[PDB]
Amino acid sequence: ISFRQQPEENACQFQRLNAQRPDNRIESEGGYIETWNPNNQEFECAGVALSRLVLRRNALRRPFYSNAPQEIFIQQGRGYFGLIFPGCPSTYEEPAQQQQQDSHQKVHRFNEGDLIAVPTGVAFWLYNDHDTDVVAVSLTDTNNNDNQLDQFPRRFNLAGNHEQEFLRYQQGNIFSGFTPEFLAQAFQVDDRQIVQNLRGENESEEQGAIVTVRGGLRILSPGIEETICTATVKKNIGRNRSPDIYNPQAGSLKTANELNLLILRWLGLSAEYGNLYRNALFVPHYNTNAHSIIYALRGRAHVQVVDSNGNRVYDEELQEGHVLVVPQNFAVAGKSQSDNFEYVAFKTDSRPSIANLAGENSVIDNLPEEVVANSYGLPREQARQLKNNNPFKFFVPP
């Protein structure tokens, strides 16, 4: 399911669909954030915004929450993240060096291939504790029903004194806007310099969203607390040894949707990770109920996309680090021109449905032979060939 705002008149009427690369980079201390322009037609149509975060060893992306739900895919690396679900008690705690030292909400490990769901207004932070840079691609669903503000994807930063991620595309931290007397009362701290730091007064716009932790972070990691407050918030789909669709001579597909990661039901979002081997084809298909935002992860594939007029709105080699939006119901097909073309496709429904146009149990396969024969002007025998020559589903070997 999904419940989203429709795009403005004509947004999904295309002369041509363009693949997109980021157009801005925001520098910080231990990494950076790159943004795709959400004002481009492809993104206006899909009603979403996209960004990419790089976190070096010991870098902390300091906590923030957003008005629009997010899905974050971990392209590379491993580390820790927390989500703060409001009012949920702490369940991670340690004895002083019995009295209590520190306690906090569950800290999660993440790995390459993980897809993480961040509900609207839930605070998120991410940390890399390893050499390999973490690279995360974040889809922010601006048109989602859950966003009751206008279609600007905001980051409400809990810390720092820097530029909002997507501010440059529109026509300080959250604490920094409150007066010192409110914050001293709120936190019962008399130390006016505790409140100064809280407000970000002891830093420039160039410390950024991401800080490096000298010596590394130490955090705890090996009724309502073990039920709703500890619901699952991520699922591995990129590294998984169990794809949903698999042909060892053509490729694989694996989805994280609301049947795999229940919280996606509330978000109205899902994602798929696919592999397509050299010269293999993902058959013409369309998504009945979702836009697809395809981020090329590795390699390259010749991709074609067809609109409701049968126009070829996109025809080229989709390369690593570029993004192609395939609007709901537009048909798409791809032939990998790499040993293994790899991609993540975010989708704007929690249970997206693929309709294959060719192959076993495809639309053509499921029409009566005489209907295929009469629709295409074909003798009964050539119609039977169209229905039966390809015995495979989804992927076709070289």
Among 5, 308, 353, 375, binds Na ion (CB under 5 A): 308
In terms of CB distance, is 15 or 99 closer to a second copy?
99
327 residue type, one letter: P
Binding of a second copy at residue 149 (CB under 8 A)? yes
- Judged by CB under 8 A, the chain residues 375 through 394 that form the site for a second copy are 375-378, 382, 384-387, 389-394
Phi, psi of 170 (to 5 degrees): -70, 155
Binding of Na ion at residue 145 (CB under 5 A)? no
> Cα(382)–Cα(47) distance, rounded to whole angstroms?
42
In terms of CB distance, is 21 or 385 closer to a second copy?
385
- Judged by CB under 8 A, the chain residues 20 through 39 that form the site for a second copy are none
Binding of a second copy at residue 86 (CB under 8 A)? yes
Total of residues contacting a second copy (CB under 8 A): 193
**Residue 100 near which of a second copy, Na ion, none (CB within 5-8 Å, type-dependent):** a second copy
Residue 101, burial from CB neighbour count under 10 angstroms (0-12, 13-18, 19+): exposed
**Residue 35 near which of a second copy, Na ion, none (CB within 5-8 Å, type-dependent):** none
**Which region among 27-35, 204-212, 288-296, 302-310 touches Na ion (by CB under 5 A)?**
302-310
Binding of a second copy at residue 40 (CB under 8 A)? no
Residue 254, SS3? strand
Calculate the CA dihedral of residues 347, 352, 357, 360 and round it to 10 degrees: 130
Calculate the CA dihedral of residues 344, 318, 16, 314 and round it to 10 degrees: -90
> Cα(298)–Cα(341) distance, rounded to whole angstroms?
6
Exposure string over 200-225, b if 16+ CB within 10 A, otherwise e: beeeeeebbbbbbbeeeeeeeeeeee
Binding of a second copy at residue 90 (CB under 8 A)? yes
Among 15, 131, 177, 339, binds a second copy (CB under 8 A): 177
Binding of a second copy at residue 290 (CB under 8 A)? yes
**Residue 45 near which of a second copy, Na ion, none (CB within 5-8 Å, type-dependent):** a second copy
In terms of CB distance, is 193 or 308 closer to Na ion?
308
> Cα(117)–Cα(158) distance, rounded to whole angstroms?
19
- The DSSP code for 7 is P
> Cα(371)–Cα(374) distance, rounded to whole angstroms?
5
Binding of a second copy at residue 221 (CB under 8 A)? yes
- Judged by CB under 8 A, the chain residues 297 through 336 that form the site for a second copy are 304, 306-313, 315, 327-329, 331, 333, 335
In terms of CB distance, is 75 or 153 closer to a second copy?
153
Among 307, 342, 349, 365, binds Na ion (CB under 5 A): 307
- The DSSP code for 271 is E
In terms of CB distance, is 29 or 146 closer to Na ion?
146
Residue 231, SS3? coil
